[PDB]
Symmetry: D8
Subunit: 77 residues, 16 copies
């Protein structure tokens, strides 16, 4: 079981710091992304690809990934 | 016992970060949802379907799920 | 030993987040309930039944349950 | 070693959240009780009987119990 | 090894919450006691006896005990 | 599984304090670097070479490394 | 490995709460001592003897000890 | 594996409190040192020798050591 | 020119403390009223009549009046 | 136009510090009184008689008076 | 020179509390409106008509008016 | 009209800084006095005489005077 | 002497709320503009024209004007 | 009526910044002096002589003077 | 007596907002300039020329001017 | 009566912003100077001469002057 999860293109997130991993396709999460962009809490790890998952961490950073949310979780192993 | 729980339509929550999982069936939890919406702490994981469970996390985010609360809790085990 | 406790009618609370579980029948806890209602920290999980237990969590949420307080604690197992 | 301790009349406290359990027998702890009453941090679990122990928790709540302090501590074990 | 330590006359302190246990016989700790008295963080558990130890907890409460400081620590066992 | 990870040129980071390790390849992470520079939270461990990984720690420090992000993560194991 | 360390003359410190143990031999640590004195965070456990070690705890208290820093650390083990 | 690490000349740091150990030879870490000096968070444990490592702790103290950074980490054992 | 303005049924407001006087008939001001009710900043001076004006003061209190907003302002004289 | 207004039984308030003077006749102002009582911001100048006016000051103190609100305001002039 | 300015449909603003009066014609002021809406600082005095002026007050409230900005300012004088 | 008011025995208060001057004979003002004593905001200018007036200032200091409250106000002239 | 100053195209600023009016042509003021944009404190009143003056107000809003800075000040009259 | 008042030995205070001028003759004002000393808000203008007046300013600084309180106040006028 | 002062090259400052106008000729004011630069409170009105005066305003902004401090002050009068 | 006071060598202070002007020759004011130095609130306007007056302003800046304190005040005129 991994401490660090590959969220695509070599970018890594600590599993123990994740609160939730969700789809980017509704208004509340879009509000969270724009808030993070304004506050300097946004990290874009999609490396030019479509955003498929939004990772919210306990430091209240918001990380964009090109990977399916369930796949990010699956990569714990 | 799992680290991440599928709360419907591929959306995942860390089990250790959950405080409570309740029905959306009364005024106080509805106040909590609207507060979270205003503050940018709301996450809607229902994928357009009826809200069946409201998840409050220790980061004081509020997550809407389309599955019953007991279903979220039962999925702690594989 | 459970991580999540059924506090009645399918509603769940994380055991590790509970500070105290008390009866609702005196002035100080009633002050705590009304404070939580005003602050948006109250959760009513009694599902139309009489409040039998008041659960205070470490996030300072206040959760109303229809179950006896000792029974909520017993459900840890 | 128990997670929840019965402090009398069915009222329960999480053992890991307790900082100290003391007698109500002097001015400083009485100051702490009145401060908690004013701030909405006081919990009275005495069920109308004499206060015998004062429990201070890490959330800086103050809980009144009708059982002796050593009795609260001893109940940590079944 | 105990979770709760008897600090005299039945009064109990959680061992994991203690930062330091010191003698009350110098100016800096006396400043700490008076600050706690003013702030409502002082607890007097000496039950009418001479203060022999001052316990500082992580919640920044200050607890007076009639017991030798090394004896309080010894009571962990 | 190691406590400290060498991120290049002798510089060390505590593994348990890392939140994320990402490429410096877009505007949001560059915003994070400049914010840290202004606030005195930036640490440059590149030893004059090209930045290949950006480490964000739970203390909300930002650490620049000359090694690829996957290399930082792989070094968790000896 | 002990929970409490005797730092001289019966005074005790929780090992898990210590951040650093250093000599009082330079201006920065002396600044830290004077700041703690002003703020009411200083604890003098030297019992009237020369300060040999300065203990900084996670509660940002500052504790003066009459024993060498290596002696405080060595006493972690019985 | 040690709880306390000797960072030179008898000075000790708790390993679990360290965030990062870096060289002092660039502008950002020098900003961190000067900030700590102004704020009263700086600790100089070099005991008159050249600074070889800068230790940042979770309490946001900054500790100067005369030892190589990798050597400080090696001393965990 | 008055220091105190009669806002109906003998209730008085200091003119110099008023920021704005508006109609209660749209969503944003209704949000302001409900926020004030929750926070303990609401004052209801309508004395059982329909709310015709909402007074926002510099202390961020919200005062309900039964009088037309322009009439409240006119009463400055 | 006076600086100090007699609000009954010798008690005085600075006119320039008053925000509003209202009847105690509804739930919101009663919430304000109880909040002030809990916080130590309440001043009772009624001298044991029925409360007829509630004065809120810019320091967010709450003062109870036994005279009608219009009487407080009229006394601004001698 | 008036204390209160009619900003349309009977709605009034204290002139001394106004910081700026601008057109709603660009992204930054629209950001300010949406921020105020989320925070409960927005006041809509347009009475259902097109927004022509945005008033920012020193209490950091944001007030929407249906009259041109120059009209608000000109009404300072009777 | 004075800037400074003699509140007895040579002690002076700036008139423009006073919020209210009240009798000390009820529970709420006694709470205010004890709060100020604990917080280091209390000033006792009675010079050994009975407290007749309690002065609350905008800095939230609380000043005890031996003079009738209406007399303190009268001394503005 | 005006209370409100026309800063171009009908946009108005209260003169008493202005701290400084400066040219936009150097790095520090550009930092101030970008900070305000991120924080939601920026107001763009240039109405599609080149920015000629940057107005900093006491509420720490930043207002862009198409008018020369000295001309904005001149319009006080 | 003067802007600056000489409080002895050339030391000056702005009259408009003074809240109260009192004797140092009781425990509460002594608490205020010691608090100011600890916080770095104390100013000693006595030039080595007995403290006769204690000046509290709106910046919550505390200034010690060697002249009687009535003398400070009387010097408001030339 | 003017409301706005020209501090060189068309840049204007409100006279009532100025706390102090000093030479850039020592370490403490240079510390103030660098702090303002880091925090986004610095304004450079020198138009590329040597700094001759440093203006600190009540909003704790720091403004660099190319004119001597006495020149800024003298321009208060027309 | 001046708005700005010359405090020596062309350096200017706004009279309305001054709280107190005192001699630098005792421990409490020296604590205030060192605090200001650490916090970045110190301004040294002595231009290489002996400090004769310490000016404390309402923004809690501390300004060193080479002029007698009573002379600074006299320069109001």
């Amino acid at each position: 079981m991994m401490k660090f999860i590959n969220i695509g293109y070599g970018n890594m997130v600590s599993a123990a710091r994740i609160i939730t991993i969700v789809s980017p396709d509704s208004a509340p999460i879009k509000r969270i992304i724009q808030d993070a962009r304004e506050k300097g809490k946004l990290v874009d790890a999609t490396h030019g690809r479509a955003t498929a998952a939004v990772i919210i961490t306990d430091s209240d950073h918001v990380i964009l990934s090109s990977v399916q949310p369930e796949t990010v979780a699956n990569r714990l192993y």
